[PDB]
Design a binder for these strands. Structure first.
Length: 91
DNA sequence: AAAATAAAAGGAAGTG
DNA sequence: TCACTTCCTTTTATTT
């Protein structure tokens, strides 16, 4: 099955939800969410997983802080900002 | 100088 | 044991 960061990385390289998520530094691997239109992206992710309840950002973001330990995606000290690890993008 | 509102944080139990 | 998911609470940041 699909992991969350791959669902995000795909949208970014897709332009699928440019309104809800966009690159901040495609180089450095930084991305950001829209404060207004983020809940719509969270809803889709939950829909692609088949969860028992509809997905919110608060819960999706919870799954993001777990990546902190494994290294895939680290939080950035800026509103609604995260960063992919080099291993996820390339070299 | 406060509120109000949103973001971040993280323990713990639940789910296939 | 993954990979989140759900819930709850508290702290921190921003915006109003």
């Amino acid at each position: 099955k699909i992991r969350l960061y791959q669902f995000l990385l795909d949208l970014l390289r897709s332009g699928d939800m440019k309104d809800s998520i966009w690159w901040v530094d495609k180089d450095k691997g930084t991305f950001q969410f829209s404060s207004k239109h983020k809940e719509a992206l969270a809803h889709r992710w939950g829909i692609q997983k088949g969860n028992r309840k509809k997905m919110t950002y608060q819960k999706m973001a919870r799954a993001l802080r777990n990546y902190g330990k494994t290294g895939e995606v680290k939080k950035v000290k800026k509103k609604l900002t995260y960063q992919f690890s080099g291993e996820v993008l390339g070299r």
